[PDB]
Design an enzyme around this catalytic site. Structure first.
Site, PDB file in Angstrom:
ATOM      1  CD  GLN B 112      -2.441  -1.454   2.646  1.00 51.42           C
ATOM      2  OE1 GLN B 112      -3.443  -0.827   3.015  1.00 51.42           O
ATOM      3  NE2 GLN B 112      -1.866  -2.367   3.396  1.00 51.42           N
TER       4      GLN B 112
ATOM      5  CB  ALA C   3       1.788 -10.467   5.057  1.00 53.71           C
ATOM      6  CD  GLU C   4       1.959  -3.550   2.576  1.00 56.96           C
ATOM      7  OE1 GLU C   4       0.856  -3.102   2.158  1.00 56.96           O
ATOM      8  OE2 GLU C   4       3.057  -2.983   2.373  1.00 56.96           O
ATOM      9  CE1 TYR C   5      -0.289  -6.441  11.645  1.00 53.93           C
ATOM     10  CE2 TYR C   5      -2.657  -6.859  11.599  1.00 53.93           C
ATOM     11  CZ  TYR C   5      -1.421  -7.069  12.157  1.00 53.93           C
ATOM     12  OH  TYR C   5      -1.377  -7.924  13.251  1.00 53.93           O
TER      13      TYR C   5
END
Lengths: 163, 163, 163
Positions: B112, C3-5
């Site tokens: 993101q 991964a990311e939140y």
């Protein structure tokens, strides 16, 4: 580059710089038109999956590879998490890690990676693979040719941005 | 986001939030119909390639960027690895690290990331690039517009999931 | 995996192994034809973006989510940088970690990831999603089926190479 461990299809070593694909959950040198998943890498600043997807470690894992935790309750009422022991695991055994096993390979999956190239590969164009060696094609971007192709070597080397 | 260092084509600073592409192995602002490789990022939690593909440093690297190790044998037969010193290395001439040079940029490649947008960009849609600024298009997914586009700002900001 | 939140749509919990998409910048289970961004993961370990794009924290951030640093000079002439405090940050509130909030999820974006599958998924082919569960399709590459589909569970598990 960002990498993970994969096992080779025949258990043999694939050398640095070769483009690879998956066959039956294992890697082999990529051929023309196949999905290129990455490149055997020696430069990976981040490597992952050294103990991933193997249900033969110290703690039990669920079907998704996560550690299973027991909820323990104390006499006062404090609740805390405790991993479930794996009956298989031997606390006095010396297990061999993936970095010491010939079949296990660091595969760069994302980032600037050095790739074996043939005489057709050009800066600023894409690549395909033949026997794991880059040929002129439509995947990725060739950043620069750092070691020009030599007939007597059978390959050159380019930095390719793999995504 | 996951990022690597890349050098700008003209050696000048590209500000954060601009979409970039590669030309001759270096970065510049992306334009219509070009491969968008990523975004200049200030939020990268993992950043790589700070000393990658340096063939003029203290330790000798092979053609794939890996450290070349000498196989050293003790009097007992015990063998271990030791990095090889570089003959072409000169400790006399100056060296400033990539992280301290303006031409070297953190480029978010995955995750993101905040991106400069024009007046056509919409939440839930993809983007293309004009002068490094996002326009309505086919790449990635706009998660949310965090600073709406206004005139005489000349841009807004959106969080984009880059992959 | 890498991964990311991400925050979920309507604060819904999404269990491990489900394929997800974005709607209005938040995640939900993926459905037929939708863009699959990743999979809820328990195997990611260290996960980026815990602080990313939090304009409600202890330090002030610019419109691109980068920390704003003030230039400080000492009496004796030394210059250094320090984060700009957010004067609208109240330390008495005791803000709660992303991991204790039902709405925040670890989403695997790249790498070998365990995925819930239906009875149509086959090794070496791609997947689409129905209610977040993999079905035979065009995305990614099924590496291996680690838990075959059973009636008793209503799903199986496969390792999928997500990129």
């Amino acid at each position: 580059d960002f990498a993970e461990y994969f096992e080779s299809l025949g258990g043999q070593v694939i050398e640095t710089g070769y483009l690879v694909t998956l066959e039956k959950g294992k890697i082999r040198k990529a051929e023309k038109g196949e999905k290129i998943i990455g490149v055997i890498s020696e430069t990976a600043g981040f490597v992952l999956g050294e103990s991933s997807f193997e249900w033969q470690g110290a703690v039990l894992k669920n079907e998704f590879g996560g550690i299973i935790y027991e909820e323990v309750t104390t006499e006062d009422g404090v609740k805390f998490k405790r991993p479930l022991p794996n009956p298989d695991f031997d606390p006095n055994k010396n297990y061999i890690p993936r970095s010491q096993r010939r079949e296990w390979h660091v595969v760069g999956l994302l980032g600037q990676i050095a790739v074996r190239i043939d005489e057709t590969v050009k800066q600023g164009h894409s690549i395909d693979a033949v026997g794991g060696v880059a040929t002129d094609g439509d995947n990725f971007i060739v950043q620069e040719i750092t070691t020009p192709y030599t007939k007597e070597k059978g390959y050159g080397v380019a930095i390719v941005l793999v995504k």
